[PDB]
Amino acid sequence: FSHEYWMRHALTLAKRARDEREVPVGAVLVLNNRVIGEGWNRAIGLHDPTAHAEIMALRQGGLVMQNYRLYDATLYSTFEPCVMCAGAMIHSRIGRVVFGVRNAKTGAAGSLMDVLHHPGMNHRVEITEGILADECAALLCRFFRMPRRVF
Amino acid sequence: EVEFSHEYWMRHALTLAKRARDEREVPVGAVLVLNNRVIGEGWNRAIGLHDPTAHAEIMALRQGGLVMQNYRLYDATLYSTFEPCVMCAGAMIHSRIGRVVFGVRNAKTGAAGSLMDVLHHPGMNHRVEITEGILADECAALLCRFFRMPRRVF
DNA sequence: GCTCGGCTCGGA
DNA sequence: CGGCTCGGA
Ligand SMILES: [Zn+2]
Ligand SMILES: [Zn+2]
């Protein structure tokens, strides 16, 4: 079970959000090489500003583990987390975040800002990028009607 | 057409903050107002629901999106009893609200001018105004007994 | 109709 | 009660 193996599962959930006319982003929560949470974007269909892929995966992980704090967990998302999504990882105290393509415009994981690696914060989450970034950019490109070169 | 003040809506957010205090949670309350009309209510429910996103401001934003049938809430004002965190402040940018009114400041991990300022960060698509110091004396009394701290920290 | 506008939902 | 803004604050 490599990072690309778990990313292939997150890409499957991202296709479900694409069929629901949402942002094609998928997220899966892994703890000790096992899935504990799944999530995909459902903001437009559910009228929820927090119905992102990573939030729904974090919401599901807290229910199965019966604890809103998920220590030493690794989340596999297809997009760079936003300020809202990155803030939930600090509250969940997860271990590592693996995203594919970077949001060079409003990214909160080292692009526009870096809240996951802030010194004044109480928790530090490691970041790993470039995992299956070719297949993650192809979905977001057709959604925003953008070329694959901006990624 | 009646216009209420910031302290009037803050007194309602203090009522919801007592509900989170009774649920053994962080005594924080939040209420969403649009054109002097309540569209969302929220208090901390992270421990009871096992939800890392069950904060006071998030649950109030989830209620506003359901009543308005739109995850974007323009020209809306949120009345919270605590300084919003990085997660809550990021949700306000996604909801495109107009103004956030909080009571006491989180001098440690505040995201509304303390540790960071994401509502007034350059390069973002939306800018939300912040109003502070509204009924901060009564908001600190609830969080003080929760964290077992004196009133001199806030 | 002649691959929408300007670009990381349509207040991107 | 510990030590500070849940108990890994
Ligand atoms: Zn996000
Ligand atoms: Zn918060």
What stretches of A11-73 adopt beta strand conformation (E)? 26-30, 35-40
End-to-end CA distance of chain B: 36
- A65 touching B (Cβ < 8 Å): yes
Number of domains in chain B: 1
B66 contacts A50 by C-beta, under 8 angstroms: no
**CA nearest B94: which of A124, A88, A91, A150?**
A88
Give dist(CA B100, CA B10) in Å, integer: 11
B51 contacts B45 by C-beta, under 8 angstroms: yes
The residue written with tokens 């912040």 in the block is: B130
Residue closest to C4, CA→C1'? A145
CA of B71 to the centre of ligand 2 (A): 18
Give dist(CA B89, CA B120) in Å, integer: 10
Could you tell me the distance in Å between the CA of residue B15 and the C1' of nucleotide C8? 41
Residue numbers of the domain that contains B50: 1-154
A147 contacts A23 by C-beta, under 8 angstroms: no
Is A54 a known active-site residue?
A: yes
**CA nearest B82: which of B52, B60, B62?**
B60
Alpha carbons within 13 angstroms on the beta-carbon side of residue B99 total 10
B52 contacts A70 by C-beta, under 8 angstroms: yes
- The experimental resolution of this structure, in angstroms, equals 2.7
Please tell me the experimental approach by which this structure was elucidated: X-ray
- From B125, which residue of chain A is nearest by alpha-carbon distance? A106
Choosing from B1, B57, B83, B129, which is the catalytic residue?
B57
Own/partner pairs for A14-23, CB < 8 Å, 24+ apart?
A14/A40, A14/A53, A14/A78, A14/A136, A14/A139, A15/A139, A16/A40, A17/A41, A17/A42, A17/A53, A18/A139, A18/A143, A20/A44, A20/A45, A21/A45, A23/A79, A23/A140, A23/A143
